[PDB]
Each structure stands twice: as structure tokens, then as C-alpha cells.
Automatic annotation (TrEMBL), chain A:
The nucleosome is a histone octamer containing two molecules each of H2A, H2B, H3 and H4 assembled in one H3-H4 heterotetramer and two H2A-H2B heterodimers. The octamer wraps approximately 147 bp of DNA. It comes from Homo sapiens (Human). One of its GO terms (molecular function) is DNA binding. The gene is H3-3B. This is Histone H3. GO terms for cellular component: nucleoplasm; nucleosome.
Amino acid sequence: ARTKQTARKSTGGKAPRKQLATKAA
Amino acid sequence: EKDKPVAEPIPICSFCLGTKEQNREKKPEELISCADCGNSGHPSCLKFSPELTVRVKALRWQCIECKTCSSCRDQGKNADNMLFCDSCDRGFHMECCDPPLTRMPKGMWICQICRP
Ligand SMILES: [Zn+2]
Ligand SMILES: [Zn+2]
Ligand SMILES: [Zn+2]
Ligand SMILES: [Zn+2]
């Protein structure tokens, strides 16, 4: 089963936010 | 869920920085977006099956961090151990399941709403 904690790990990391901001605008 | 407004979606996948026009395999793939913060992911980057993807697109879906327990509406001190339904991706604290769970379920887990 997945929990919030295990889903964080199994999904893989988010991209660097500065890079998501550079892309969001 | 029928009642709480939905945040403006961000049209960029938070995991791979692609749009609906490009996922990690250089192919178009529609995003799903958190109703509370608007952050988005490709289903393939979220590691959702096609069946789960269909179900969450029809629900007020929340991202991992925003997910609140469907029973008590809280995150709380035990938020990290909240279960995520493998059918509808709703969150439930173990102590808020019906019936309550003392231990983590093994394998795929289906919540009290999806259970026939
Ligand atoms: Zn992606
Ligand atoms: Zn969110
Ligand atoms: Zn709860
Ligand atoms: Zn469910």
C-alpha cells in the first residue's frame, strides 16, 4: 500500500523549483 | 469535494518540466492538476496506472502534499502515514478507516469508498 511518505519516494523527486519558475514564465 | 473550489492549474509538470505536449518519452500526455495548489504532473511521472488516471480525472484530486484525509479532512501529526487508495487516490489515516487499521495493509489497497 502507499502512504504519503512512501509515495514521495516511489514517485521520484520534483524538479528544482527555480527551474519550474524559469519555465512557468 | 463537490463543494470546494479548484485552484488555477499550472500547465507544467512539476516532475519533468514538460507540458501537455511532451512527457519524459517525448510524447504528448495530458496533465492532472491538484485542486488545492494547482501544481501538475503527467500521469506517467506520477506513476499512475491508466485506470487510476481515469478515476482521478473525475475527482477533486489532491497532490501528495495537499492530500487530506477523506474522513476527518485533516492532515495532522500522522500525515506522512496517510494511506492513498490505489483505485481513487483518496487519502485516509489508518485510524480513520472503516474499520480502523492498526497496521499498514499489504499490497494494493482499496479504500472504503471504492470497495463494493
Ligand atoms: Zn512529467
Ligand atoms: Zn497540491
Ligand atoms: Zn483522518
Ligand atoms: Zn478509493
